[PDB]
């Protein structure tokens, strides 16, 4: 009745939704009520808002997996829900990239970050990131259609525009963000390897390797499946395995959303104290 990998994907999606909604809601409420929108916290707040939106949209995918299809919603939802999900996911990716860029900047360019790095500038950059995410995730909204063709709704979408969207998603969601993150954290480590970073370069190195490894583990299966499915025709050994592991790949990429508040917002000791204080309210 069900595949073991499918049940694993279902349980991972449920765990991700349940834990991530609570964590992202806590972080968002703390940073939007009990804390000030300082220059350092703006990126965390934007990223956690994107992760919260992705986690809130996750139960739609969970129900779709449970129902094995059979879309019960209208055409406008078959147009907006897949667009909102992808917007939230890639906004989280690009905000991770922007956090890496800012962390490299507050180290390699400390003077410029004192005069020309304000809260307004942080909001401007985050808004530009959101704009890029919307521009990248408008094609799914354009190309979503609610067909039926059977006893149930068959909302789907090799085609050259499908190839284009999956390839640009691969490139600007994995290769550019992953390379930027690796370069920024490598440069932070290399700069800390000079002098006066005795207290750092040990917690910083661990944080950098942890966050890059989490990004890699969480996001690689999704893009790998997305590219190989277009590359490899169905009805094969590792086309059946690929279709089987598609759902687990999405599950891991979504669990990235629940991971992120712990790696970014909960990393701060002051934020830890604020969350502990606000846990009894």
């Amino acid at each position: 009745l069900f595949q073991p990998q499918d049940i694993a994907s279902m349980v991972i999606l449920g765990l991700t939704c349940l834990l991530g909604l609570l964590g992202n809601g806590l972080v968002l409420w703390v940073a939007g009520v009990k804390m000030k929108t300082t220059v350092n916290t703006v990126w965390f707040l934007h990223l956690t808002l994107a992760d919260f939106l992705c986690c809130l949209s996750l139960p739609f995918s969970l129900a779709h997996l449970i129902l094995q299809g059979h879309w019960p919603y209208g055409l406008f939802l078959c147009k907006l829900i897949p667009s909102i999900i992808i917007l939230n996911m890639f906004a989280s990716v690009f905000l991770l990239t922007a956090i890496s860029l800012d962390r490299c900047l507050i180290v390699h360019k400390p003077i410029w970050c004192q005069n020309h790095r304000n809260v307004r500038t942080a909001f401007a950059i985050c808004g530009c990131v959101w704009v890029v995410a919307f521009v990248m995730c408008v094609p799914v909204f354009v190309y979503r259609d609610l067909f039926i063709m059977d006893n149930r709704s068959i909302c789907r979408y090799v085609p050259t525009p499908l190839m284009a969207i999956t390839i640009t998603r691969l490139v600007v969601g994995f290769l550019v963000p992953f390379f930027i993150m690796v370069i920024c954290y490598s440069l932070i480590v290399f700069r800390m390897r000079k002098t006066n970073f005795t207290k750092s370069r040990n917690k910083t190195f661990r944080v950098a390797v942890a966050v890059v490894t989490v990004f890699f583990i969480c996001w690689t299966p999704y893009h790998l499946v997305g590219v190989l499915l277009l590359i490899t025709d169905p009805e094969s050994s590792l086309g059946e395995a690929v279709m089987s592991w598609d759902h687990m790949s999405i599950a891991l990429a979504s669990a990235n959303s629940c991971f992120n508040p712990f790696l970014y917002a909960l990393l701060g000791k002051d934020f830890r104290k604020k969350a502990r204080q606000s846990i009894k309210g």
Binding site: S61, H64, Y157, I250
Partner: peptide, 13 residues
């Protein structure tokens, strides 16, 4: 078998 999974494509993808 595989076509059924193809046609049940998740909204996230």
């Amino acid at each position: 078998r595989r076509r059924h999974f193809h046609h049940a494509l998740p909204p996230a993808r």
